[PDB]
From a paper:
In 2007, an Rpf2-subcomplex comprising two assembly factors (Rpf2 and Rrs1), two ribosomal proteins (RpL5 and RpL11) and 5S rRNA was isolated from Saccharomyces cerevisiae (Sc). Moreover, depletion blocked the conversion of 27SB pre-rRNA to 7S and 25.5S pre-rRNA. These results suggested that Rpf2 and Rrs1 load 5S rRNA, RpL5 and RpL11 into the 90S precursor. Here we describe the crystal structure of the Rpf2-Rrs1 core complex, which contains the N-terminal domains of both Rpf2 and Rrs1. Moreover, the binding region of Rpf2 necessary for 5S rRNA recognition was identified. These results show that the N-terminal domain of Rpf2 plays a critical role in binding to both 5S rRNA and Rrs1.
A proteolysis-resistant complex of AnRpf2 and AnRrs1 (Rpf2-Rrs1 core complex), comprising residues 18–262 of AnRpf2 and residues 10–113 of AnRrs1, was crystallized into an orthorhombic P212121 space group with the unit-cell parameters a = 54.1, b = 123.3, c = 133.8 Å (22). The Rpf2-Rrs1 core complex structure was determined to a resolution of 2.35 Å. The crystal contained two independent Rpf2-Rrs1 core complexes (complex-1: chain A(Rpf2)-B(Rrs1) and complex-2: chain C(Rpf2)-D(Rrs1)). The structure comprised a wide, twisted half β-barrel in which 10 β-strands were surrounded by four α-helices and two 310 turn helices. Rrs1 was composed of a single long α-helix (residues 52–74), four short β-strands and a long C-terminal loop (residues 88–104). Three regions contributed to the molecular interactions between Rpf2 and Rrs1. These were the long α-helix (α1), β-sheets and C-terminal proline-rich loop (residues 88–104) of Rrs1. The amphiphilic long α-helix of Rrs1 formed both hydrophobic and hydrophilic interactions with the wide β-sheet of Rpf2. Two β-strands (β1, β2) of Rrs1 joined the central β-sheet of Rpf2 to complete the 12-stranded β-barrel structure and the other two β-strands (β3, β4) formed a three-stranded β-sheet with the β7 strand of Rpf2. The long C-terminal loop of Rrs1 wrapped around the side of Rpf2.
Numbering used by the authors:
A (entry chain B): 17 to 104
B (entry chain A): 19 to 254
Write the structure that this text describes.
Amino acid sequence: ERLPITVSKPTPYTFDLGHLLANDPNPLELPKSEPLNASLKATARDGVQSLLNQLLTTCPITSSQQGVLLTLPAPSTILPRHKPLPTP
Amino acid sequence: KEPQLIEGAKRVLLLHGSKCPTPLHTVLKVFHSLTTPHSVLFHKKNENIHPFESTESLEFLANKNDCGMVIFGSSNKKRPNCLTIARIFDSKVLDMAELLLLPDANGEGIPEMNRLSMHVAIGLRPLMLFSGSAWDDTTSTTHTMLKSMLVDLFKGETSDKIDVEGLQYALMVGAEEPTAGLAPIIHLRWYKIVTKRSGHKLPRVELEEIGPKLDFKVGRIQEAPRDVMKEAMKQG
């Protein structure tokens, strides 16, 4: 009720929760008045806030003896294979 | 060893060239730790290996260790502190990229480490954040390749389930907004995630800086033949 859990930027974040991934397409803000690591840390904090919000909000949660588990959607970012698709 | 319909974690080979400097070795060690248990660290002082001259020996070591990815440290006058990332498809190199390690913020350097942090379990899946507009540019083949490679490198073993307790750390790969005439720069930073109560049902996120703080300048790129690439992109 007093500290914001929402981040807003001109361009919205995108997500690939299957890879636990978030994209912040907004320009990387690196002000000269501030140390690099601080700016990077701020951007990162915003992005991880967004990513965690998305994970907790949009994923199915299952609580059991196996623990508290998020169900992740299949990875949307397609990556190259190591070995060719097997002989059928 | 034989083709599988669903491949597991892409195995990673980490090795280095002649007289590779200490920061690069630290990077190789940390990367080795982050890709545990599906990585291989070769401590040989390898010489005569020059990937952009020939990927043959590279392919040999990678295939002999059944690795789909190779991280090769090297250094010379023209290209100092060079980290070469190469992917292997069908026993040959698919695509390749150079990342040249930039000097520290100014005068601390890169501390010697063998792992990311004592506050982070070895082999945990990272949260990943790609910040900057370059990652969203479909015409920048460099950033497309780098994003693909980095996700491929650090995704570990993907699964449709994850414990809420496993969400402990994040990797940010920030692409500096590019300028004409200059090679693109990227920043890699790791953070321990600390969640505080915020009043809302969603927790407030704060970060703790952890691990090495890496700044890279992109060097040479070797793209994959569209034939080979589209063959590699086919999902079963």
